Amino acid sequence: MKAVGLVVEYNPFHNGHLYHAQTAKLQTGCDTAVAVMSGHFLQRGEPAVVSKWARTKMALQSGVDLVIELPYLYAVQKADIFARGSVSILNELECEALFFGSENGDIKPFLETAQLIDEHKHILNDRIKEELKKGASYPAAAAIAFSSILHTESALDLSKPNNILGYQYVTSILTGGYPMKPYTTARINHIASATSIRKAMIGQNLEACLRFLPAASARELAAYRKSFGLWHTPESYFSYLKYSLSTVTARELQQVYEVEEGLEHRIIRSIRKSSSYQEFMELLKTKRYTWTRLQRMNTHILTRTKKQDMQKLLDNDKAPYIRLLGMTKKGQAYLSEKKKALSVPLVSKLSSFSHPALDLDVKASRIYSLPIEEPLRTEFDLQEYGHAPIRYDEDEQHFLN
Amino acid sequence: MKAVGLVVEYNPFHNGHLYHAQTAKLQTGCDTAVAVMSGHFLQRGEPAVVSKWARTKMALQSGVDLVIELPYLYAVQKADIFARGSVSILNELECEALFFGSENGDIKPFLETAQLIDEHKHILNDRIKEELKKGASYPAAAAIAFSSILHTESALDLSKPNNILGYQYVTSILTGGYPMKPYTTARINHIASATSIRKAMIGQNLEACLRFLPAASARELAAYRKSFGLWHTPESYFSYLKYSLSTVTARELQQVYEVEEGLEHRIIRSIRKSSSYQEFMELLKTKRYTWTRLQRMNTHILTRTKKQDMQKLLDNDKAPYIRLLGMTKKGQAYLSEKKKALSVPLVSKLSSFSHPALDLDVKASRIYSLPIEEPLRTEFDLQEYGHAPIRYDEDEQHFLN
Numbered sequence: 001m002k003a004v005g006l007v008v009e010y011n012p013f014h015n016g017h018l019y020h021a022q023t024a025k026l027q028t029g030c031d032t033a034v035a036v037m038s039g040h041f042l043q044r045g046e047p048a049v050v051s052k053w054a055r056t057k058m059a060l061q062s063g064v065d066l067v068i069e070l071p072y073l074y075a076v077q078k079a080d081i082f083a084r085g086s087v088s089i090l091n092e093l094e095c096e097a098l099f100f101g102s103e104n105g106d107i108k109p110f111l112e113t114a115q116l117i118d119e120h121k122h123i124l125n126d127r128i129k130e131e132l133k134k135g136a137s138y139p140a141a142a143a144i145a146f147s148s149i150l151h152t153e154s155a156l157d158l159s160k161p162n163n164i165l166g167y168q169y170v171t172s173i174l175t176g177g178y179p180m181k182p183y184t185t186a187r188i189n190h191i192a193s194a195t196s197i198r199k200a201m202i203g204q205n206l207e208a209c210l211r212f213l214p215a216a217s218a219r220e221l222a223a224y225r226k227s228f229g230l231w232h233t234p235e236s237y238f239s240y241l242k243y244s245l246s247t248v249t250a251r252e253l254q255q256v257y258e259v260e261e262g263l264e265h266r267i268i269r270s271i272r273k274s275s276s277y278q279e280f281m282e283l284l285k286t287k288r289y290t291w292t293r294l295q296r297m298n299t300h301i302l303t304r305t306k307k308q309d310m311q312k313l314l315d316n317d318k319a320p321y322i323r324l325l326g327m328t329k330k331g332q333a334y335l336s337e338k339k340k341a342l343s344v345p346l347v348s349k350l351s352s353f354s355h356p357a358l359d360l361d362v363k364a365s366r367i368y369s370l371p372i373e374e375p376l377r378t379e380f381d382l383q384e385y386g387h388a389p390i391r392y393d394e395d396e397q398h399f400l401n
Numbered sequence: 402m403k404a405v406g407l408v409v410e411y412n413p414f415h416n417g418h419l420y421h422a423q424t425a426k427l428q429t430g431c432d433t434a435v436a437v438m439s440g441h442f443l444q445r446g447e448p449a450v451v452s453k454w455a456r457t458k459m460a461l462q463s464g465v466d467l468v469i470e471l472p473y474l475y476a477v478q479k480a481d482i483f484a485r486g487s488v489s490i491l492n493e494l495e496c497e498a499l500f501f502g503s504e505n506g507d508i509k510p511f512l513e514t515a516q517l518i519d520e521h522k523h524i525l526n527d528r529i530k531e532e533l534k535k536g537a538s539y540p541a542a543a544a545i546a547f548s549s550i551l552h553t554e555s556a557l558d559l560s561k562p563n564n565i566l567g568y569q570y571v572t573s574i575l576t577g578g579y580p581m582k583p584y585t586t587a588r589i590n591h592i593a594s595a596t597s598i599r600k601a602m603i604g605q606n607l608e609a610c611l612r613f614l615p616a617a618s619a620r621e622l623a624a625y626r627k628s629f630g631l632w633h634t635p636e637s638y639f640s641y642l643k644y645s646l647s648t649v650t651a652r653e654l655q656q657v658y659e660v661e662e663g664l665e666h667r668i669i670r671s672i673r674k675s676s677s678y679q680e681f682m683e684l685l686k687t688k689r690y691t692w693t694r695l696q697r698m699n700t701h702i703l704t705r706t707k708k709q710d711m712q713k714l715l716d717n718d719k720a721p722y723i724r725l726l727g728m729t730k731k732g733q734a735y736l737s738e739k740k741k742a743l744s745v746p747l748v749s750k751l752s753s754f755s756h757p758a759l760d761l762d763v764k765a766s767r768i769y770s771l772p773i774e775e776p777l778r779t780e781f782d783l784q785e786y787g788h789a790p791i792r793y794d795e796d797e798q799h800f801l802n
């Protein structure tokens with residue numbers, strides 16, 4: 001029994017993710033598609049459009065045989081970390097293959113690059129420090145030390161996000177020596193981006209996207225906004241940002257993960273004067289901050305994730321548990337074959353196991369429902385517990401729950 | 402030139418608060434009424450229905466010359482600390498008198514009882530000893546001891562609220578040593594209660610309660626609706642309380658003012674399944690905790706105010722500052738006269754002092770404003786720092802700002 005690992009956030013799951021889930025089992029020759037998926041808040045930092053449950057349902061119907069949560073711990077993080085944790089989990093489940101889309105359909109410049117870099121790493125740090133002492137900044141001196149190599153005609157721009165994430169998966173693998181072989185391909189009824197789609201739904205358009213989405217995906221989104229009366233946007237949580245920053249002191253906000261020393265003053269000062277999440281952001285920007293890092297920071301503020309929480313939990317080199325979000329027939333059989341093999345707990349009912357990282361995913365799960373109006377919100381908050389793990393019948397369409 | 406102090410929440414100012422003020426000036430023989438007022442969160446633990454700037458504007462034209470904010474420090478407390486703080490504020494302001502309403506026009510029985518409990522305090526306490534030793538609860542013992550000296554029919558009714566408030570005022574003037582003379586009248590355009598007028602407005606219908614409202618009150622009220630788009634209810638804040646108990650740890654929740662040892666768990670159990678502040682209060686209520694005390698707790702859980710900060714600030718024997726909301730030309734005169742004599746700062750613009758208790762005040766407002774739909778919330782927020790004292794001219798209608 002063979003599975004291919006898929007590092008994903010389906011937000012929503014679109015034609016590109018569909019083609020990638022069919023080609024996964026095609027090109028990696030594994031009978032099973034196992035995805036680790038960001039739960040509620042994601043790597044880009046934003047809230048998911050729809051809960052991890054219903055996105056699970058867009059996935060199980062599009063050819064993903066198994067779906068596990070990527071803990072907030074790994075999910076909302078710099079890609080170097082995000083990659084590590086995700087691949088880590090795909091290896092605990094013993095996925096022999098890994099498969100990603102990318103701006104370079106060629107795996108060879110990925111492998112070549114990483115191998116090349118570790119081949120020279122000493123050179124890299126000598127030239128980095130040789131620029132640094134000359135007064136160069138961190139990313140500059142790194143950009144220079146790195147462009148001292150790799151800059152040949154190869155391209156594979158690692159200025160491109162998928163090349164980044166993919167290089168980082170591959171790096172996590174090699175570094176870890178995982179017996180999981182990586183694969184990649186380029187990205188192109190039709191296909192537009194998850195984000196173009198998203199902003200198109202923000203623009204009061206859903207079926208406009210239907211060419212860009214499979215059936216299950218749209219069918220799912222519709223029932224979500226139907227039930228809870230919203231698509232979740234970063235802006236939707238602005239009040240709770242305001243509120244949350246309203247009660248905190250400087251020293252306490254200093255301790256939140258991804259808040260650099262001294263910036264707490266700027267944050268606290270700016271949130272007052274910002275009638276918009278956008279204004280808030282522009283008031284916050286420093287060149288030591290990407291925009292995604294600012295979003296991530298804002299999430300950590302929202303969920304009150306502390307430097308010591310995150311750093312005492314990031315230390316470990318294995319994954320704390322496996323959260324099972326959903327499974328197919330194939331998925332079920334795979335999880336059954338390898339069940340006893342897991343070196344870490346398999347969490348189905350939350351009741352079974354309690355963990356600080358788990359406590360953190362639940363935390364995010366409660367923060368997620370806040371823009372939901374009640375009674376709907378109180379009922380939403382049930383799903384993290386008394387939700388029996390989703391199951392779906394691959395052959396002719398059945399959910400057994 | 403002699404001042405009569407009033408202890409008031411004005412929620413909102415109605416024709417009866419008008420009775421209070423004008424009867425005050427007339428009965429005490431003072432030409433100046435100074436009111437110390439709970440601003441955005443009141444004695445029983447709930448929010449004001451309209452901003453303290455507005456209600457200041459109301460009273461200023463209804464015959465109050467000075468409006469001083471009762472710090473949150475003393476405002477959300479049971480009657481004795483509430484009265485301790487407000488009476489310290491009035492004593493700082495050199496009021497010859499303190500005029501409080503009850504169902505009694507007679508100032509005497511408050512005096513008689515006051516001295517009675519004041520002198521028997523030894524006897525009373527010693528009598529609580531024996532009763533706790535027999536196995537009674539403390540309140541039981543308390544009722545038993547009070548009953549021995551008190552049950553003579555004086556008859557001071559400690560049931561009717563404003564009577565209790567009266568008694569504690571008398572008590573504070575007594576142990577404080579203030580040169581203050583308590584006065585009083587029976588409470589009774591026949592006036593209607595503040596609350597039923599609230600329910601009126603809440604029901605969106607402000608038209609039933611008019612004849613009971615001074616005109617300016619009606620104006621500034623509807624002006625607050627039209628300006629900021631709501632009347633404030635406790636339920637407005639439920640979602641935010643729901644955020645607060647999400648982002649707190651039970652150890653952290655134990656340090657919240659009025660969360661007594663061990664209750665934080667009942668709290669957390671109750672919040673996740675409660676769709677309303679009502680239901681929440683319902684599951685929460687205990688014998689150890691009355692409705693209003695729980696509203697106080699829930700409020701402190703909103704402001705996330707810690708116990709040690711609180712104790713620190715309650716330790717101060719006089720009010721940390723005198724906070725100026727508004728003044729007439731008379732109030733301005735009286736102020737300029739007694740200002741030299743104030744022993745703690747007079748605050749007009751917020752930049753004029755820094756104290757932990759004022760931080761508390763400003764944060765209380767920052768929480769208060771949240772229900773306002775953004776950007777209007779931000780505009781409102783600009784006031785606490787923005788608004789300098791509201792100045793009315795009794796020679797009719799000149800506001801100078």
Ligand SMILES: Nc1ncnc2c1ncn2[C@@H]1O[C@H](CO[P@@](=O)(S)OP(=O)(O)OP(=O)(O)O)[C@@H](O)[C@H]1O
Pocket residue numbers: 007008009010011015016017020099100101102162185186187188191192193194195
């Ligand atoms: N059209 C496409 N072609 C090829 N690969 C694709 C793809 N769309 C996604 N993938 C790959 O499918 C995997 C899942 O992508 P996530 O679920 S992490 O979302 P995302 O891809 O960043 O969003 P998007 O860019 O708006 O589509 C990734 O490795 C992708 O490279």
Ligand SMILES: Nc1ncnc2c1ncn2[C@@H]1O[C@H](CO[P@@](=O)(S)OP(=O)(O)OP(=O)(O)O)[C@@H](O)[C@H]1O
Pocket residue numbers: 408409410411412416417418419420421500501502503563587588589592593594595596
């Ligand atoms: N109609 C009236 N007659 C006499 N005194 C009155 C009065 N209305 C108010 N006062 C006095 O005015 C002062 C301020 O009362 P707060 O502003 S604290 O509200 P509250 O009166 O408790 O509200 P309620 O009980 O729901 O009606 C008190 O000394 C009152 O005795």
